[PDB]
Each structure stands twice: as structure tokens, then as C-alpha cells.
Ligand binder design. Sequence first.
Ligand code: ALF
Ligand SMILES: [Mg+2]
Length: 991
Amino acid sequence: RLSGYCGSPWRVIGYHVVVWMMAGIPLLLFRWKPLWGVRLRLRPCNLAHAETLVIEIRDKEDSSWQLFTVQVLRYYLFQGQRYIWIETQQAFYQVSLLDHGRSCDDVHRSRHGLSLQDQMVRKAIYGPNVISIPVKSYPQLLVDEALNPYYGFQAFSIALWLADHYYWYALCIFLISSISICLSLYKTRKQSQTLRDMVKLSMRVCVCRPGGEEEWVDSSELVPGDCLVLPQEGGLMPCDAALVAGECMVNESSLTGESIPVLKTALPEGLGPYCAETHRRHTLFCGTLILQARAYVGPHVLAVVTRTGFCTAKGGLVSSILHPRPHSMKFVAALSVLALLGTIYSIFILYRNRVPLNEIVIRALDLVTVVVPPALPAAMTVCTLYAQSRLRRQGIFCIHPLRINLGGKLQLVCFDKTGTLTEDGLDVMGVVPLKGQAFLPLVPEPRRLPVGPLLRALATCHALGDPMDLKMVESTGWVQAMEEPPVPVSVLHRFPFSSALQRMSVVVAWPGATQPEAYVKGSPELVAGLCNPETVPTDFAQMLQSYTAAGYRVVALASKPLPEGDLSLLGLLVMRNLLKPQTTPVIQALRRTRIRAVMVTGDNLQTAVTVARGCGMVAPQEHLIIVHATHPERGQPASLESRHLALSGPTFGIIVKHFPKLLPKVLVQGTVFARMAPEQKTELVCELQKLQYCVGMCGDGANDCGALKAADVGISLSQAEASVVSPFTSSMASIECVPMVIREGRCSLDTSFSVFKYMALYSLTQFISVLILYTINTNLGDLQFLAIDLVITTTVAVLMSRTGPALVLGRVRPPGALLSVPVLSSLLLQMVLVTGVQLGGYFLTLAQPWFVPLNRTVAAPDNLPNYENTVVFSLSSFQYLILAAAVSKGAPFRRPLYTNVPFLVALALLSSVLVGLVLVPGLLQGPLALRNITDTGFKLLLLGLVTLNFVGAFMLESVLDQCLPACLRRLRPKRASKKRFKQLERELAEQ
Ligand code: ALF
Ligand SMILES: [Mg+2]
């Protein structure tokens, strides 16, 4: 990204502090884009060699960052990256490796150990080795989360309610909002604390010094440029190191996800630039568990430190998941302009009828805050809490309830090979060559088939920690081994595996009758070449190349009778990933429901294609895409095994380096991505989300943490340090946890849409009720308002979010747009219908024989009792339940409506109490302050009107649920939009 920086330290000491303390009042609105507020007070225009306040200018992007420059040499912090100031270059440069300017291999040989000098300046420039996690206090979280326009409007509404006699419900809303705020702050603080505890590390390391002395200091004192000694026993790697002498076996499961040894060699050649990307076979990354180290020269291994902190992607992952981590804004705006037209119309009415003498600033703001209800967040959050409780009862832990509503529009789910789809360990089923005479290739054979020396070798050759040895001993049927049933065999000594010899030997000296034999295990080529004088090989390389192309691990065994010079091949041992039987139905249902599923793995491409073919991801065909090389003047060949594509690490890098061309095609048609780095996975997730894709990552290891956090939703299995930010977390390791989560998300989205529609209808009908009441010049009592807002709103919010998800996955996803055509059309029709039926009763009772008419001279809260106010209250209380029953759904993708017994009995009790309060007076309208009319014919007509409005709302819902004019009249169709569908149609047309 192309961006600049500029500034100046101070203008002048003086009245500037008073200016700041007097202009910090509009800071609430100056929070977003504070560059204008900063330049309005403190912004000198002069030479810019020394700066303290740094501002960000918009050159290619649209952002605004505020940074502070500290003096130690001056530098500032920006997205976790240090930027020191160079006096010779007169410009800011990033603190990282010198590979950008000039690099070579001679300095890596000449940097063997550093003295006490030049260490403090390097520590001040590069910073500490530990990754400092920025923690914030409680007021910091308060100012960061709160003080948005929504909470400001809610506080204004609360103050307005406190100004009136609305104390009870106002303090109720205040206390529930406070509980929600404290809960969110506690959750955020716990997340920050566990993230800081996971990221931080402290252990003793050995640092070499010039002269021939070694000291043990803390890991924070490690600065790029010294020498690090790897322990022989192994341990956690706190910083990046480059091998200079000797070789070591290290586990790269923190970056790939496989617990296999990685071949790491030294650097015997020199005079070459250090790219740190193509030399992965020489240097090793940080955070890798050390298994075994060795060196042919020197008493200890020699390794030089090249980069620490936010350089070797360690802090890079955190800085990439923290800061740039990626229908809202039109419904509230449409309700605001609608309220503005309604609040000014009431002013003209009040100024003419009674002239309330400055009581209009209270009645108009009342309608303003009634149009926009404050109980919407609670009514939308109760459903998420119910869904989280249901998931926890099922066995799925959730930490963020706001992601449940977003989890209903999933269309792309990522699956990991190791851990998620398969197990972490390596299993075994038997030995394919039943004889040691180079048998012809065939299907693999199960266990228990060999017997005698072969069975003894397969059951005794083990270093028992190692999951493969455990699988072998549990599959061989022998558990000193009992139930042989011949005489048991005993071992005396075993040779530990090392890096110098790739063959593990095991000697046996049992006192049995026959001659004992020694069994070894290692690379197949070595034992095959060694056993040549004993037995001849026939079709030996074909089996190895087939197992390598099919993603199989080869293990050979040899035997030699004794009373490593001579050996005799007996059989070959193979390994599998043990594909779970429950994985196939899940992906089958996903492909049936038109839910795209891709595979993101860190191993080679051959194993990825093998797993995809075994599970059934690519049914029609499978295509592989590989690039010739990385240097310019390259090509894009086509290799053969809708259309699915397979990519690799460097392949995806070369594709993403060509962003302005053919990248959306690869993102749409490509489904297999092997050897993907954590940063590469995060970049792929970001690029996919840039195409309006609801990508959902699902993994258990620590390598895919960046992709799991950068995605919209993250499913975490096998609880570990990589499950502290991900909202979805399942206790079991089964793959069937995805369909239930998708169903719960769809149900929550449908319930949230229904709640939003009901709230909009309630707000609009209350608005028109207040309008007609101001036309009549009378106001309802505060007690009635409180009673309604409790026993209707809380009742529906508790008894409408209990509906469970559908039985099976739906064919079509629910609409995730609150401003669509049918949703708006049905809402407008219901609104005009309720407006036509509500004011009708007033016009009807105006013609009926009426007694003791009201006088429009007394104040609004003093004209009670009267007929108009009580009939308006009755009509509104009836229409509330009418709308609540009309917006109730759940047939397509949820539980049936008749299954909700509590909601049904609550609606029945509400209707009963309403008809009791309407028909018969006494003992029910005492504190309600009503006229207590005794007109039987009027009550019968009101019940008939309620019934006809009921059946009319039912007919309207039934005819609007067909959406026939929304589909049959779609000319022109929905083309020229939904870029995913456009790319799909372009791909199916051009191919
Ligand atoms: F364990 Al992986 F991609 F193979 F996270
Ligand atoms: Mg994994």
C-alpha cells in the first residue's frame, strides 16, 4: 500500500492546553476520522525531521490512524510494526531483515556470536523478543465499544423517559443494558487475557559470546544477530534461527499441522542473497518443537538468529487477525425521515388545538423515541442466547452470540485434513507383501494374516509416545506378549532412532529353541539395496512411486538370523489417514444442498487429491494447476489427473501476484489448496471475503488459526490455544457438528427477521396510533403504556425465540436481506391494512349514538376517563396480537407453529383477558382509568371487526407467502448483480 506520513511536534506552549480542554467536548463525534480535530488545534507546518504526533493521509486507501512517537533514536508503533528514523536517509523505514536493501551469506557466517557492545542499540531498534499484547482498562473498553450513535440515542431516550413518569420501564431498560455492557466487557477482557497468556512465553535459552563462553539468559534478551544453541533434548522454539552447521530433526506442526519430522540441513554454500522463502530446507521457522539435534563439528550446534518478534510471522499473524479483520444502514434512516415528517405534523396540530405552552418539546420527542424502539437489541439477542443455550445442551460451546445471526448465510465451508476430517495419529491395517519374494502389486491385506517370524517382527519392532507403534501393537493382536499362543518372546535392548542413521534396529536374544532373529525398520531403498545379495528385487520402485503419488507412507522391514551387515526383506508396511465414515454423508448433504465445500491443507497436493477422491469432493473430474517457476517470463501449463481446480503454496502465490487478471475465476473454480501457509491462508480468506463470500473456516490445529479468525465464522475442535477468539467450539471431534450449526444459524436468522418485521410493524402502528390520538387531542396513561410494553414485548421476546431448527438441511437458504422486495411489499401491505382497519372503528363510533362527548380544553393526561382513548387502547392492544400472530412463522425451515405450546397458551390467555376486559366491566379496569362502557352491540361489532381483520391478515399472509409476482414477473432477471453468480455463469459459458 502506498501511503505517506507527516507532522510536527509542537506549536507553542501556552493556551493550547485550554484550547484542547475546551474543544474536547465534540470528541464524541470527532472520534471517527480525528485527523480534522487534530489539525484544527495542534498542527504546525514546518520541517518534518523530528515528529511526535503522526497522522495518516489517504493516498490509495480510506483510513485514519493516530500514532504516538516515543523517544528511546526515535520511533513509533503502527499495527505492531516498528518504524525507526534514519538521519542519513531522511525517511522512515520498517524494522525487519535487511533483505530489501542488500543481503548476502557472508554476514551470516561472520555473525558468529556478538559481544555486549552493539546489543543495546539493536535491542532498542528491533524491540523485545516477547510479543507485547496491548491491554486496555475498563474505561478504555467503554469508550471503544460504547458512544456509538445507537447508544447515544438510547441514552437520550432513557433521559427523556426519566423526564416523564416512565421511571419503572426506563430503569429496567437501563439495568438490562448495563448488565449486557458488563457482560460484553468481561467477555472481551477474558479474551484479551487468554490471548496475552497464550502469545506470551518465557524460557531459558543459551546465547553464545565471543571468546568461548556461553551464558543462560531470558528469551526476551534475544536480539536478531546473536548465536542460539538448540538443546539436545529439545524444547519450544522462541525465535527464528538459521542452521550454520549440522542437521536437526524438527516438528513443523505449528505451521503445517502434521507431527512428522522435517529435514533441516545447514548452509554449506555462500555468496548468495537470503530470501528466507526459497531456503526453507536450510532454515527453520519459530514456534517449532525441537525433536533431535546434532552436529558433525563443534561440541554444540551453531545457529544464528536472524529475526525475532513481528518479523518471522509470529507477531505478523496476530497483527493480521487483530487490526485488518473484516441490511444495516437504511431501515433506521428510512424510519428517521418518516419520524421527522410525523413529529413536525404533530407540532402543527398541537399549536392549533390547545397551544400546550411549551409542552410540545415533550410530546414530539415522545413520538420520536416511540418510532425507534429501544427494545430491539434485547429482542434480537434473546434468540441468540437461546440458540447458544441449545448448542451448549447439544455439546457446542459458543462465546460470541452476535455471530449466530451471521452464521445463517454460510455458502463456503473449509475442511482441514489432519484433525478435522481425519485423526491426528497414523494407523495401520496390515502388510501388503505377504511374502518376501517381491510379490506383485495388489489390494492391501488386513492384519492377522502373517504368522511366525513375520508376526513376531511386526509385533516386537517398536520403540515403546509414538502413535504408530501403539496402532501396530493394537492391530497385531498381541498385548512380553501373552496369548501368542507359543512361548512368549522377550527383548533385551533396542537402538534409539537418530538423524545419522535412518534405520531403527532391534536385537532379540530370546532363549527359544529356534535361532533368534534381529528386525530393523527404516527407509525401504536402503534395506532393498542392502538385501540385494540375499534376495533379488522385482517391481520395487513402482510400489514406492505409487504410494508416494497416492499419499502413503512406506515402511520396510528386514530380518537377519544371529547365533547390520546382511539383511533380508520380508514385507512393506503402509500407512493411511483413516478417513472417518461420517465424513462422506456430511459432504454428500452439503453438495446436495448446493453448499460449496473446499479443502485447505498444508501437505503436498498428491495427498490432497487422494483425500478428495476418497471422500468424494470431486465427482465429475479433478484438475491440477501448477506453474513453471516464480521468475518472470513464466507459463501456465495444463495438467490432467462443474470444474474443480487444485493449487499449491507457490502456485497460489503466483496466482495472487496476478490479482488484476483471472483471479476471480481461480477463486470460484478452485477448491483444493495444498501447502498453504498461515499467512497465505489468511490472505486467501480475505480475498474470498472480498468477493462477497461467506467463508467459514473449520479447523483444530494452530496453523490455520489465522484463517479461522479472519473468516466470518470459525468452528474450533479439539480445544487448545487456537480456540480463544473463534465463536463456535464443539467438544466432540465429529464432523457432523457442521449441519447442526448451519441449521441453528438459519433458524436464528429467520427468527431475527421475524422479530425485526414485528418490531417495525409495532413501531409503525404505535406511530399512527399516536397520530390519531393527537388528532383527537388525548394521550394514553403511563400505566397502560408500561403494562403493554411489558406483557406484550417481553412475552413475545421470551416465547417466540424457543422455536428450534428444521429437521434436515434446506434446499434454499433463507433471505439475508432486510430490504428485499417481498419483505418490504408484505410489510407495506400489512401496514396499509392495519391503518385502514384501525381508524375505521373511530369513524364508525362517530356515527353511532354517542353520549357525554369529551371536551378538548383540558390537558391530555387529564381528560380520562373517555371513550376515544379507551377504544384506541383496545384497538391497539388487539392489533398488537394480530400482528404477533401474523408475523409468526416457522413452517419452511423451523419447527411447526402448533408445536409451540407455551406461545399458543400465552396468546390464548391474552385473548381471553382482552375479551374479558372488553365485554364485562368491573374488577379489571379500576387502575386503567377507563369509561367502562356497557354497550353490548358495540362490543359485538368490535369482536366482529377483530375477527374479520384476523381472517384478512391470514389471507394476506397466505397470498404474500407465494411471492408469485416477485418471481414470475422478474423481467429483467437478477443478472448484472451477485458477482458470484456472474462468475459462475461466465465460467460455465466460456467452458
Ligand atoms: F493440519 Al492442516 F492444514 F493439514 F491444518
Ligand atoms: Mg489440522
